Write an enzyme that holds these catalytic residues in place. Structure first.
Site, PDB file in Angstrom:
ATOM      1  N   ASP A  37       1.569  -0.079   9.038  1.00 53.13           N
ATOM      2  CA  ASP A  37       0.152  -0.306   8.749  1.00 53.13           C
ATOM      3  C   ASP A  37      -0.712   0.772   9.401  1.00 53.13           C
ATOM      4  OD1 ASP A  37      -2.120  -1.448   7.702  1.00 53.13           O
ATOM      5  OD2 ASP A  37      -2.309  -2.963   9.273  1.00 53.13           O
ATOM      6  N   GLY A  77     -13.049  -6.586  11.414  1.00 57.44           N
ATOM      7  CA  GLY A  77     -13.653  -5.276  11.322  1.00 57.44           C
ATOM      8  C   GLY A  77     -13.332  -4.341  12.463  1.00 57.44           C
ATOM      9  N   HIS A 135      -4.117  -0.992   5.846  1.00 59.40           N
ATOM     10  CA  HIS A 135      -4.779  -2.064   5.110  1.00 59.40           C
ATOM     11  C   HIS A 135      -6.289  -1.867   5.034  1.00 59.40           C
ATOM     12  CE1 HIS A 135      -5.576  -3.996   9.117  1.00 59.40           C
ATOM     13  NE2 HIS A 135      -6.633  -4.459   8.475  1.00 59.40           N
ATOM     14  N   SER A 195      -9.958  -3.575  13.329  1.00 59.29           N
ATOM     15  CA  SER A 195      -8.694  -2.885  13.114  1.00 59.29           C
ATOM     16  C   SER A 195      -8.924  -1.379  13.176  1.00 59.29           C
ATOM     17  CB  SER A 195      -8.081  -3.277  11.767  1.00 59.29           C
ATOM     18  OG  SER A 195      -8.859  -2.814  10.680  1.00 59.29           O
TER      19      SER A 195
END
Ligand code: OMV
Ligand code: ZN
EC number: 3.4.22.-
Length: 197
Positions: free
Chosen positions: A99, A155, A75, A157
């Site tokens: 993901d 911010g 993502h 991830s």
């Protein structure tokens, strides 16, 4: 068709220094250089450390080197290439169901070792160099010992969850929040990375 433009590469813009006794963020490239590098895909900056701060033209997040692979979240990176000294590097792993995406780890980076400790006392490293204690609650979930607004995790991830010995246990993927307060985190377990590999 002549009208069609191409998405830029992910660009390393800094790192989370975990070498010394204090964790702290370092920036290695400013926004103008980031935009330039995202367009050409050519990044000649020296890379160091395990946790990189990465940016697209529109988003910023983290990327973590584990077993020679720089991992981050789909993502954030999508299917984008990553900038390198020789040009854009195509993803080595892409799994939207997890993901997760990954590139070969850049030259000069250091890789975290996959955890085999089986410990549930974890530590999440954020883009602001906060080391947040997290208790593992499942294969892919952990609770914050000290909850805080989701703003503090935005911010981050792609950042690592570490065991007490500093091994990589997972990649930060999502936050579980109640009234904007992050109480738990979802993450990609290192075992899932080792399987994908
Ligand atoms: C209820 C569903 C539950 O929880 C949540 O979804 N909660 C939300 C609360 C958001 C509010 C802010 C959250 C704060 C920090 C969060 C750490 C970070 C982060 O920091 N991103 S970021 O760096 O800022 C950014 C956007 C890259 C630049 N992740 C996120 O924001 C993450 C992005 C998205 O979720 C996913 N999108 C995708 C998209 C794909 O193709 C497009 C494929 C698979 C995929 N898989 C996901 C799980 C929403 N996300 C949440 O975290 C999913 C798992 C547990 C339950
Ligand atoms: Zn361990």
């Amino acid at each position: 068709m002549a009208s069609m433009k191409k998405k830029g590469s992910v660009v390393i813009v800094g790192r989370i220094n975990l070498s010394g006794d204090t964790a702290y963020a370092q920036q290695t490239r400013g926004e103008e250089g980031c935009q330039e590098t995202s367009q050409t895909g050519r990044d000649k900056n020296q890379v160091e450390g395990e946790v990189q701060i990465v940016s697209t033209a529109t988003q910023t997040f983290l990327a973590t080197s584990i077993n020679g692979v720089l991992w981050t979240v789909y993502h954030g990176a999508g299917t984008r290439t990553i900038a390198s000294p020789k040009g854009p590097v195509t993803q080595m792993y892409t799994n939207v169901d997890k993901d997760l995406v990954g590139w070969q780890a850049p030259q000069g980076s250091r890789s975290l070792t996959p955890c085999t400790c089986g410990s549930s006392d974890l530590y999440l490293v954020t883009r602001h160099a906060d080391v947040i204690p997290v208790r593992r609650r499942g294969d892919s979930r952990g609770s914050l010992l000290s909850p805080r607004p989701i703003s503090y995790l935005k911010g981050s991830s792609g950042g690592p969850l570490l065991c007490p010995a500093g091994h990589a246990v997972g990649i930060f993927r999502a936050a579980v929040s109640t009234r904007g307060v992050a109480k738990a985190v979802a993450f990609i377990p290192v075992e899932s990375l080792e399987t994908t590999m």
